[PDB]
Symmetry: D2
Subunit: 221 residues, 4 copies
C-alpha cells in the first residue's frame, strides 16, 4: 500500500552470480522481482544464460537483460557495465555474489558500477558458509568498510550480508541446526529478504555493515 518507503518499485538492480535455481542470488532475485524491481543479470560463464532465460520465466520481468561477466576478469567487468549503461541506463544498485578470489571482484565492480549510479545507490555483497577463521569475515567486513568510505561521498551505500549454511545448496550443520539460537537454517529467500532491506530505502542511514542472515549462530561466539 504505502510501503513505498522501500522505494524499490521500478528501480533497476544488477543481480550477479545467479549460477543455477538454488543460488542465493536467485532468492534475492525473486524477493526483488516480487517487490517491483526491474533487474539485470550477470552470468559469469557459458551456457547457463539458459537456466536463466528459463529462470526468468518465473519472474515478471518484461525485458530480459543478460550479460556474461566474468567478475574474475576485469574488462569483462568494465564492458559489462558500460554495456549495461548503454543498453539500459542508470542502476540503483547491484547485488553482488562474493585471497580476494572474490574480494577484488567486489572492489572492481563497486568502482565500475558507480558510474551508473549518478544520483547514488546501494551495493549489497554476500558471503556464504572451510574451517578457520574468521578472519575471513574480519577481512570481508573490512573490505566493505573501505568501500563504504569511498563511495560514501557519492551517496552510494555499501553493505555485506554474511550467509549461514543453507541445506538445499558437514551434514554437520546439523550442528547449527541444533545450536543456532533459532534452531533451524536459513535459506535464500530469507537472505534475499535482507538484501531487499539493504538495497531498499529503509536501510537509509546504514553503510559499511555486515548483517549475518544465519539464524543467530554468530552469537554462539
Amino acid at each position: 500500500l504505502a510501503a513505498a518507503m522501500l522505494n524499490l518499485e521500478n528501480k533497476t538492480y544488477v543481480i550477479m552470480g545467479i549460477a543455477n535455481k538454488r543460488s542465493i542470488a536467485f532468492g534475492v532475485a525473486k524477493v526483488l522481482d516480487q517487490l517491483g524491481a526491474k533487474l539485470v543479470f550477470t552470468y559469469r560463464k557459458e551456457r547457463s544464460r539458459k537456466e536463466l532465460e528459463k529462470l526468468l520465466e518465473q519472474l515478471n520481468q518484461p525485458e530480459a537483460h543478460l550479460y556474461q561477466i566474468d567478475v574474475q576478469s576485469d574488462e569483462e567487468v568494465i564492458n559489462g557495465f558500460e554495456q549495461i549503461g548503454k543498453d539500459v541506463g542508470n542502476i540503483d544498485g547491484v547485488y553482488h555474489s562474493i585471497q580476494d578470489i572474490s574480494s577484488y571482484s567486489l572492489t572492481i565492480v563497486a568502482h565500475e558500477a558507480k558510474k551508473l549510479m549518478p544520483e547514488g545507490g546501494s551495493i549489497v555483497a554476500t558471503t556464504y558458509l572451510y574451517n578457520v577463521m574468521g578472519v575471513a569475515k574480519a577481512s570481508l567486513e573490512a573490505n566493505v568498510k573501505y568501500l563504504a568510505l569511498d563511495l560514501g561521498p557519492d551517496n552510494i551505500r555499501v553493505n555485506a550480508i554474511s550467509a549461514g549454511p543453507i541445506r538445499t545448496l558437514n551434514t554437520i550443520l546439523k550442528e547449527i541446526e541444533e545450536r543456532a539460537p533459532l534452531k533451524r537454517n536459513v535459506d535464500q529467500v530469507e537472505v534475499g529478504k535482507t538484501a531487499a532491506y539493504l538495497l531498499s530505502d529503509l536501510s537509509s542511514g546504514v553503510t559499511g555493515e555486515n548483517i549475518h542472515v544465519d539464524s543467530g549462530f554468530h552469537a554462539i561466539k
Copy 2:
C-alpha cells in the same frame, strides 16, 4: 501491494521510551503506524501521557493504549506487561528505548515480554549517541547476543540498533557531519525505518545483531 512480506500490518507492538516529540521511539512509532501496526505505549514517568494522547493524534491508532512503566523498577515492568496482556492480549514485538542503567531493564522486559509472544516475536533495543568506550557497545552487543540465545528457542528474535548523533535531539558532531562516509546525520525516521526492518518479517533469519543506523561512521574505525 504485495509487500505484505513485511507482515507488520495488524501486529501489535509495544513501543517504550517515547519521551517527547523528537524521541526516536517516536520515529519508530510513526514509520510503524504508517505501516499498519497497532501499537501500545510505554511512558516511564508522570505527565507525558499527555504529550502522548496528543502525540498519537498524528497516528491513526483507533484504540489508545498507554502504560506507565518505569523500566527502572521491576514490578512496574511485570504489571505492565500482564496488565497489557490482560488489556489487549498477545504482542508480536516490543521496541525498547536503551552499569545496565538500561541493560537490566532490557533483560527484564525481554523476559516479561515473552509471556506475550506465545507464537514468538521480535524485540528491537536501541542505544544512542560520553567519551569512551566502546566498550559500551561491546557490552551492549553482548547483552543482546545473550538474549538472542535465550529466547531463540522460543522463536523470539532479539536485535539492537546503535543510533548515531541526531541534530534535533559537541556541536562537534559537525565532526561526523564531515567524516561519516555519507557526510550527514541520521534522524529518527531512518532509525525507526531499520526498526521496522528488524521487527518485521524481512529480518527473518537475523538475531543477536547490532545494526548501526549512523550514516556509516562506525566504519571510520
Copy 3:
C-alpha cells in the same frame, strides 16, 4: 651475571594489594625480591600489616616500608604516595592489584604515582579470574590503552596482566585444567614472573598491552 638487562636490581617498586600469603601480589613480591628490587608496600585495610611484617620475613628487604592505602579512597591514595615520596623518594614502578571498583583506583594511582617517577617508570596492573563478559577485559584492556597514552609522553610504560584461575587462591576450572592448551593452571609466581618482565627493562618498547598469564586459555576463544 650480565642479565642486568633487566635493570630491576635496586630499583624500588610499590607493590599493592598483597592481602594474605597466597595473594598474587605476593608472588610478584617474591620474584621481584629475589631479583634485587627494594620494595614498598601497600596494605589496603587494618591489621594485615601483620601478615606483612611477618611476610616480609621471607624477603631480604633491609628496610621495611608499609603504607595503609585504601585504593578505594583517594586522599588515601594521595597521601600515600607523597608520603612515600617523602619517606623513600623516587619509584621505578608500582605493581597494582586490580564499574571501576578497581578501574578508577588504577587511574588514580597512575596519576599519583607518576609524580614519583621523574625519569619515568613502569606500571603493571593485574586482573584475576563471574560469568560474562568479557567485556570486562575489553573495558580493562581499554583503560590500560588510555593510560598508555597519557603517561607515554612522560616515559612511564603502562601494561596489564590478565590472571587465569589459580588453585591455591567452580572446582569447574577443572575445565581449564583440561582445555587450556598447556593443560594446567597458573600460579602467582608465574604471574609475578611476567610482572617482572613488564616492570623490568626487557619489555622496553611494550606499553598498553595485556599479557594473559593463563596457561593459554584465552586461545580457546
Copy 4:
C-alpha cells in the same frame, strides 16, 4: 646472579631469518647470545652464510652451526631440522622470522621443530611493519592461537611478537614517532629483548599471545 629464572643459559635455539646485520633476528640473536644461549642458524638462501660466519664473530658461540633453510620449501625444512637433530640434538626453542607467504612456513617448522623438543619448548614468531588491515595480525594472531592448542599438549609454548617500524631497517613513520605513546621507535634489541622473555622461562604460563613490541602504537587504535 640468581636471575637463572630465565633459564636460557645453555639452552639451544634455532634462530631463523637472520638476513644481513640489521635484521631483527639479529637483535634477538645477540640479546640471546649475551644471555648464555647456544644458537643455531638458519639461512634461507645462498651466500649470506658469509655475513654470518662473520656475523657470529661478534657473538661468543664456540660452535658454529648454519643451515640453509628455505622456509618457502618444505623438505628444505624437514631435512633442516632432522639434520640439526642429527648434528646437535635437542632444541629448547626456535625464533622464527615471519596468503601465508610466511604463515605456512611457521606452521611447518612448528611441526618439524617439535620433534626436537621432547621435553618441550618455546617457539616465538615475529611479524614486522602495506596499508591495510589488520586483518593481517587478526589472521596472524589466529594462526598462533591454533598452534598454541596443538603443541600445548606437548608443552611447547607458542607466541608472536608484532614488530613496529624500526628506522635502521613512509619516512612517514615520523607519524608513529610522533603519535606512539612513547614518542619514539623500536629497534631490534628491544624486539629481541621481548623474544628473550618469550623463549625464556619467565613467560612460563603464557601461550598463544601477541606482544606488540611497537612503542605503544597499537593503542592509538
